From a paper:
In the salvage pathway, extracellular PLP is first converted to pyridoxal (PL) by non-specific alkaline phosphatases, then PL or the B6 vitamers, pyridoxine (PN) and pyridoxamine (PM), are taken up into cells where they are phosphorylated by the enzyme pyridoxal kinase (PdxK). Genome analysis suggests that trypanosomatids, including the African trypanosome T. brucei, lack genes for de novo biosynthesis of vitamin B6 and are therefore dependent on the salvage pathway, particularly PdxK, for the production of PLP. The genetic studies presented here clearly demonstrate that pyridoxal kinase activity is essential for growth and survival of Trypanosoma brucei in vitro and in vivo. The resulting structure revealed that TbPdxK has a typical ribokinase central core of β-sheets surrounded by α-helices.
The secondary structure of each monomer comprises a 6-stranded parallel central β-sheet (strands 1, 2, 5, 6, 7, 8), a 2-stranded anti-parallel β-sheet (strands 3 and 4), and a 3-stranded anti-parallel β-sheet (strands 9, 10, 11). These are flanked by four α-helices on one side and 3 on the other. Two loops (120–129, and 266–274) are missing from the model due to their flexibility and resulting lack of electron density, and several amino acids had to be truncated to alanine residues in the model as a result of side-chain flexibility (Lys99, Lys130, Glu131, Arg188, Arg223, Glu265 and Ser275). The crystal structure of TbPdxK shows that the ATP takes on two alternate conformations in this crystal form. Compared with the human and sheep ATP-bound form, the adenine ring is rotated through 90° resulting in different protein contacts. The TbPdxK adenine amine interacts with His220 carbonyl while in the human and sheep enzymes the interactions are with Val226, Ala228, and Phe230 backbone atoms (the latter via a water molecule). In the two different ATP binding modes of TbPdxK, the γ-phosphates make different interactions. In one conformation, the γ-phosphate interacts with Asp117 and Glu152, as seen in human and E. coli PdxK. In the second conformation, the interactions are with Thr227, as in sheep PdxK, and backbone atoms of Tyr224 and Gly228. The conserved GTGD ribokinase motif is present in the TbPdxK amino acid sequence (residues 226–229), and is seen in this structure to bind the γ-phosphate as in sheep PdxK, rather than the α-phosphate as seen for human and E. coli.
Author numbering:
A (entry chain A), B (entry chain A): 1 to 120, 130 to 188, 192 to 264, 275 to 299
Amino acid sequence: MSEKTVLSIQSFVTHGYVGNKAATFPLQLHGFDVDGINTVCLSNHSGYPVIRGHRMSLQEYDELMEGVRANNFLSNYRYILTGYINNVDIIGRIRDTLKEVRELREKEDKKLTFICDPVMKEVLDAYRELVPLADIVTPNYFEASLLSGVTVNDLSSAILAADWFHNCGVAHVIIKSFRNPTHLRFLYSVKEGSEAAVRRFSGVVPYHEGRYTGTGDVFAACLLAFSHSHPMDVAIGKSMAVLQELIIATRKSRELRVVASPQVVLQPSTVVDVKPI
Amino acid sequence: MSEKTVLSIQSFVTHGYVGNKAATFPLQLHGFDVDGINTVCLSNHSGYPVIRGHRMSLQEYDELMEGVRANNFLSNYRYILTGYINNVDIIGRIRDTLKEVRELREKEDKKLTFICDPVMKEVLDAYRELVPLADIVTPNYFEASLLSGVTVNDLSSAILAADWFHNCGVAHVIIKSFRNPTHLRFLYSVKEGSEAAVRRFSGVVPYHEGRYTGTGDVFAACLLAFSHSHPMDVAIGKSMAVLQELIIATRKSRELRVVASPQVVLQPSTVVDVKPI
Ligand SMILES: Nc1ncnc2c1ncn2[C@@H]1O[C@H](COP(=O)(O)OP(=O)(O)OP(=O)(O)O)[C@@H](O)[C@H]1O
Ligand SMILES: Nc1ncnc2c1ncn2[C@@H]1O[C@H](COP(=O)(O)OP(=O)(O)OP(=O)(O)O)[C@@H](O)[C@H]1O
């Protein structure tokens, strides 16, 4: 408990649990004031026969942001969370949105934590430019492979990928999974500065067959929430646990029912060991 | 606990607690799957020096709805909740959105409850056409005065206003307040059909000086939630209590901090007597 304000910039769907709908409830459950910017407002996520809706233009984004800036809302965000954007100009514009906030915050001696979930064209080049400004990044193995140039097959390659992120400026790197078969392994790598020694942690979670929509979005939201007063390694463990229990709860590519299981999001009971290397 | 699906059609702001942001969290806290349609996506509510953002056009609404309809999402809403729309064509279109859902539901022998918060031009005429389809309406005194043609000054006039709503087809009418000075009085009036006797209830809540944004939006959301398994009179009492406690909690035109007080939304402790007349 402290300043729990988040600007969350992600997709929005009317039906299903992805993007800002998936992120906002877990955050609010943990006491966070979430200011949302919906980069798209669609009918649903991919998977269905049909998808429709509105996609935010650069003009619309800029215009929204005029109000947000003019009314001094930028000074009051302790966190920025980005998810699915898929627009070169806007992900390109977020570099600016981030930079306006950080300077506003630093001038009043308050902190800012930018958590970038690099959800993935020319969008890749734009992410390569944005990720260096992140305090925490949460790539899946595919996104880590694309950004770093290193195919993330296993722990060793995951570590080389994570080094790329530290080299471009990122302190905290979570590579959320890679697949001995009946488990998924993750890597957390932390390097608190150029002249700072890197420490790595790894752990596993049981693999469950099938696909589950919105897992990455809920993970990032829980990571933010748990990172507020838990050390990062503990926060990663609790986030992995939330997902592990939610994926099991829906076993009784389909939705996670987070709303049906709020105590799981608040207080996961499954223990995930995030073990130092 | 039962089918807790809601299609909620209201405004959305990035900053502040109004519209769909104000409604969605209380509903989710009570276990509801909320499918949101954001009729506008603005930077903030009225009150600030500047307001900016996007307003949904008829074309956009229709296009969104194509996806929602095509994917058979309409059949799975137990509730429809409407709030701030302010667009003749769209509030005009909601008549259709409502009618598609009701027939889909009736054909599978399931129920539908439409709660209309008639937030208020040519918009008035359009509401006069939409309100007859509502199961529950939640006008403030101004909106009851505008719709009915009767100035709602006191209990007697509130009752004549409520009669207008029953006459055009509405079973459950809540006139949320009118101002002996240190209290606000409300009226709940129920008439379960043309050939059904009207019953009325009234109660009071302590008046608190100042303005508080989003009270109507949170009230309607809590009413829906509490109406699910409580009788309506009890549900009105609990909703009035939630607001009464939230307005007191922010005393320690400014925001209600619902996220800071989730147990108040789930389990209000203040008792509001909804007394039969
Ligand atoms: N069967 C599963 N599918 C997806 N995620 C799982 C599964 N089982 C466990 N998880 C947990 O969910 C977390 C997020 O999964 P992943 O790394 O695939 O993100 P993602 O691919 O972005 O997910 P999504 O695309 O669904 O948002 C993983 O770190 C993992 O611990
Ligand atoms: N000082 C107050 N201001 C507003 N609402 C209050 C106040 N004190 C108690 N309330 C409760 O809040 C409920 C909603 O208020 P009201 O009927 O004014 O809706 P509204 O005018 O639509 O509010 P808003 O415009 O803020 O959404 C009332 O029924 C009342 O019981």
